[PDB]
Write a protein that binds this ligand. Structure first.
Ligand code: Q5B
Ligand code: Q5B
Lengths: 616, 616, 78
């Protein structure tokens, strides 16, 4: 039928990635008992792909296309386009959609579209027998069949205003917000709207109020016409002329807003672009008087609009023109979790706890302390580690010992396992992060990661009362190396000055070094056997950290036991040595190093015999 | 006061990790407007630590202790223990709690506790002036003050039965479920219960009904006593004797269930352990008659219990003994998300989509196909990769080509970057996973990860119409190596039989090898310049995979373009080469290899001068 | 548990391994390699699935995290 704009079979494209509007349309389709969604595809100029949304409680996928012609070719059944383009692109996108043979209706939401562009869109629509609703409108809706984007708001409002089933009222306004208020007014004073359209408030619209009023006049389902206009322009005079020419025979309720204008200055431009009475004819008074004289049902003010609707509907009901129908079942829809959570209706437990930092407020917190206060107090990198790892604001000398360790272990040449693996990955053309992790993954019991075990084993020996000789003897009997003892290149003949530097700092600044004194006694015994069995840098860090925690006053015996048991201290070597690993990776990139392959002459290939692989 | 069991200041321990019971107690404390939770700590014999729960909508932490003495010493203010221990440990845990000077009340939930154990608990409680509620009970509650575990169920039931404010009724039963039904009956026929206790259904309880009835008689807030007993045992005769001795002056409503017993066989043992009338005196008839004769308000049947409550309450109200009070404000609590979701009240969008497998049903699915059908059809490892990576059930020869590639690239000796790094990490004592990832992170443009780029560059050259000589020439001008060309040890003089094996398979089984033919023409030109510029194994895999996808009929031109653009094919080398990496790691562990340190004689140390580091 | 236990039965009964060889396999830890190798198929599949889906950067929702900072008193002493 030519008079029908939208029906329950209407398929549409949504131009612009407006996820809320998309969900609102789908929610209406669901409560109206539609078999399939009213949206065939989304036109997203920035990206083609998929969009996930709800169909009641079930999630569905909507296809997303970059252009209007690509979407139209994929879904030729879609004849409506809900255009959310900005005022900067509303004209070219509407004109592109109007040039598509399969698109018949375009709803232009954008405010601020030039009057000339709207004139050209309106003329293009009239020439091609198409419809432009807008610009500067929410759209409109056919009750129980289709909604344009955000028209009629929340599903709660749709249910309260009974918009999931059609009535007998054909409604048209200029205002988008007043179209929703009118849906409420009409539902309370009649069987509700059949269809409602807001043409927008621009003085040159894509479609005039009369275009829609003439469709309502042809539609047999509509027995009552209602409209709400405003001052400025001569749109309402098209209706009054049609009313005088007997082109509108159905009873028409009409009200023109802007009665305030003569009381206020002539220069006042109202909200809508077209709401400014340039001539006397353009005023609300001249329009409401001409409406009264044409035979329309005009109320005393906007306050008695619903009462006039009630009077006209009741008249049709008594005369038999309109028939009373049974109210269909009230539809239901699940509430969005975010709404139920915001209103305090529901609670949901957290899966994780975080006690070391908080990024969720106005300012980042490290163990409850604002980053600003950490920096103003010059806590430094050692103080940041005190907060994030230990949840303590450490004494200055304890934060400086952490920084001293980082500098001392930053690098120990390219030959060590971690630096060697990071260099091989860098020579293989790997990025910095992959190369770094390739080297960090060698940190363990033999290379670097002996700190936790040195702290653990020396603390146990000294605490359980073992004499240094008994500890050395016990570990040998178990076949277990003493962690923190031994080195590949450092020895009695080649002393490790890093160990000396850590020991001088602890002697000058720690209130006590009892575990260090015990460790040095163990070292005298091990080096007496083999010169390479020195207290290495990992053993030195672990042992000194126990003395630091024991003597600084900031840790209880339980806290120290927890630190030892959980393994914090290897983190210091990983963090410090990452400086040298990144340096070695960058050095190989600057050198333009080639791919490494280990020389064959350094590998003894010793394959098993055929006999060996056949049995045991 | 000696008559008060629990008040709004009562603090309790929950023995057993019963998270639902813990939440129910906290929810009651919250709706009763308590300042702090009624639970001081949880006793979890398996673990000490923390438990996170709600206080309205806010999350709080409750401490968890391994033993009763440790919890009691930490929270001496807690005088109640809600014991959820099984019947196997209910006695020893209740006896341990009773031996604690600070614990006064123990509620024993367990069913199936020996009669002898209950006799000893009851006597121990009486000797120490303590209270044992149970065994085999939900507990009880003081309206508006404290609840034992699960007593009175959901917050909805607490609100419907007005249990957040005290009434004038002192209630006691044997049955736990009937205690909740009674709370509903009493609330509808009076001002509700002040306190209600279920002593359990065992024939030797920790506390008899009279113990609680005597406390209600001393309490001035209670003006009415109500009780519901049952057949078996002589508990109710203690009440009737106290009623006869004028020890209970307040009006008492009483009903003894089990009137069915004489109609049924004498051998029938009812639900509760103590519900079996051994003698005539133990029957419901003898008990209800003795109650009637003692002056109690006994109904005709259980049906008129609420009516008897209504009669006794109304009598007190007219006589002025009980005063009408104003109903306090109805408390509120947020619904648990899981309940709102189950009832369909709310919906919540998913963050992720998964299209390749589903583990959430009765059987694991790989791209929609049941694992059982994958195995019954002998799709093999190649068929599993077809499903999980390509979402296709591939032709058999295509799945076998994937398996052939995995075997061919499984290992290429210990000298290559990935195997070398995995060996160094294994020599450093690293676990298998760390060592494996150390080696996998070398896979990139020079080692292994050239497959995607070989497929990309050869496909582009052949598609855009470049002659092999023009492609070789163009790449040289851009200073870009041709990916899939060149090798460290394989060359014209040392041919790569792996490349030959892949080429023979494709010639025997692929409908076409056009990209391979083009690649071999490029190889003739590169090897003419330098013998090491052969088509390597990575170039061979990438090029042949394009021919496989192009000719097998299972992929559209778009699907092939997507595979090339996204980079699937390097995954084949990572997967295949992981076999040899794991092998090299295990080989070094079997060999007992020592920590590696790269020899100094293989490194030229070339430090910058002091002048170089001071300026540019 | 099923893979580890069955692999011991396989090694014990196939005739290809001596008691010492089986003890060495158990002590050194070979069998977790089977899960790393097998599960790499699904890991690569999940990585590729997210690339095909055009998935955006993930950030764990704040509503799933209880931020419980220590007090100033807690960070000053023990
Ligand atoms: C360091 C090394 C692997 C050396 O191994 P080797 O392969 O040379 O020696 P092994 O084959 O194990 O044995 C040789 C003989 O001495 C005996 N023997 C050896 N160590 C013994 C011991 N700890 N306790 C008792 N006895 C021992 C053994 O029992 C045998 O004697 P015997 O039985 O009579 O034949 C080894 O000592 C060891 O594991 N130490 C413990 C782990 C440790 O603390 N790691 C941290 C080192 S700091 C670091 O990683 C940072 C670094 O400084 C690194 C760098 O620069 O290199 C940097 O900043 O980068
Ligand atoms: C393979 C290698 C890094 C070798 O590098 P090299 O360091 O020896 O050579 P470069 O220093 O780059 O240059 C030497 C001279 O030849 C020229 N030239 C070299 N390659 C050239 C080329 N592709 N296109 C044009 N020209 C080239 C260059 O322009 C210069 O000539 P000139 O300028 O005149 O002085 C190199 O070819 C390369 O990057 N190829 C592309 C990446 C690639 O496909 N990788 C996969 C290899 S299969 C694999 O990884 C698996 C493996 O088989 C590994 C194993 O077993 O080892 C296993 O199973 O484990």
């Amino acid at each position: 039928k030519d008079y029908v704009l939208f029906d329950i079979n209407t398929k549409a494209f949504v131009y612009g990635y407006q996820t809320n509007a998309i969900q609102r349309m789908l929610d209406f389709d669901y409560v109206c008992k539609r078999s399939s969604p009213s949206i065939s595809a989304i036109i997203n100029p920035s990206r083609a792909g998929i969009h996930k949304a709800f169909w009641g409680t079930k999630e569905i996928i909507l296809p997303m296309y970059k252009t209007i012609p690509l979407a139209a070719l994929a879904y030729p059944e879609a004849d409506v386009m809900v255009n959310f383009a900005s005022h900067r692109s509303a004209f070219e996108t509407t004109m592109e959609a109007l040039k598509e043979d399969t698109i018949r209706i375009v709803a232009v939401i954008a405010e601020g579209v030039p009057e000339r562009q709207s004139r050209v869109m309106a003329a293009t629509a009239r020439k091609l027998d198409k419809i432009v609703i807008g610009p500067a409108t929410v759209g409109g809706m056919t009750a129980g069949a289709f909604r344009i984007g955000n028209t009629a708001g929340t599903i709660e409002n749709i249910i309260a205003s009974k918009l999931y089933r059609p009535g007998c009222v054909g409604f048209v306004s200029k205002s988008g917000g007043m179209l929703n208020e009118a849906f409420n007014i009409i539902s309370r004073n009649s069987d509700g709207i059949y269809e409602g359209v807001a043409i927008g408030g621009d003085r040159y619209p894509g479609s005039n109020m009369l275009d829609h009023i003439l469709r309502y006049e042809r539609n047999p389902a509509i027995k009552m016409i209602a409209c709400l206009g405003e001052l400025g322009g001569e749109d309402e005079y098209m209706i009054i002329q049609a009313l005088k020419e007997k082109k509108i025979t159905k009873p028409l309720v009409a009200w023109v807003t802007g009665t305030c204008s003569p009381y206020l200055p002539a220069s006042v431009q109202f909200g809508h672009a077209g709401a400014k009475a340039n001539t006397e004819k353009e005023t609300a008074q001249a329009k409401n008087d001409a409406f009264r004289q044409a035979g329309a049902y005009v109320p005393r003010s906007f306050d008695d609009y619903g009462e006039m609707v009630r009077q006209v509907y009741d008249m049709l009901l008594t005369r038999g023109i309109v028939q009373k129908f049974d109210e269909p079942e009230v539809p239901r829809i699940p509430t969005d979790y975010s709404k139920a959570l915001a209103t305090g209706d529901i609670r949901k437990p957290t899966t994780f706890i975080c006690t070391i930092s908080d990024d969720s407020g106005e300012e980042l917190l490290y163990a409850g302390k604002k980053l600003s206060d950490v920096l103003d107090r010059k806590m430094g990198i050692g103080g940041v580690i005190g907060l994030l790892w230990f949840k303590k604001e450490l004494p200055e000398y304890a934060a400086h010992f952490i920084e001293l360790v980082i500098q001392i272990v930053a690098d120990h040449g390219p030959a060590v396992s971690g630096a060697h693996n990071a260099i091989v990955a860098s020579c293989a053309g790997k990025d910095l992060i992959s190369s770094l992790c390739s080297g960090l993954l060698t940190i363990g019991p033999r290379f670097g990661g002996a700190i936790d075990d040195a702290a653990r084993e020396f603390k146990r020996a000294q605490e359980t009362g073992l004499a240094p000789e008994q500890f050395v003897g016990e570990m040998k009997k178990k076949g277990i190396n003493i962690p923190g003892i031994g080195h590949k290149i450092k020895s009695v003949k080649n002393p490790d000055k890093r160990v000396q530097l850590l020991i001088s700092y602890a002697r000058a600044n720690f209130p006590s070094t009892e575990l260090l004194n015990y460790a040095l006694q163990v070292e005298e015994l091990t080096t007496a056997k083999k010169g390479n069995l020195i207290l290495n840098v990992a053993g030195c860090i672990g042992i000194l950290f126990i003395d630091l925690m024991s003597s600084c006053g900031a840790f209880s015996k339980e806290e120290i036991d927890e630190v030892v048991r959980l393994g914090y201290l290897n983190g210091l070597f990983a963090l410090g040595r990452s400086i040298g690993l990144i340096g070695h990776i960058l050095d190989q990139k600057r050198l333009g190093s080639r791919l490494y392959r280990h020389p064959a002459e350094d590998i003894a290939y010793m394959m098993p015999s055929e006999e060996e692989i056949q049995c045991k």
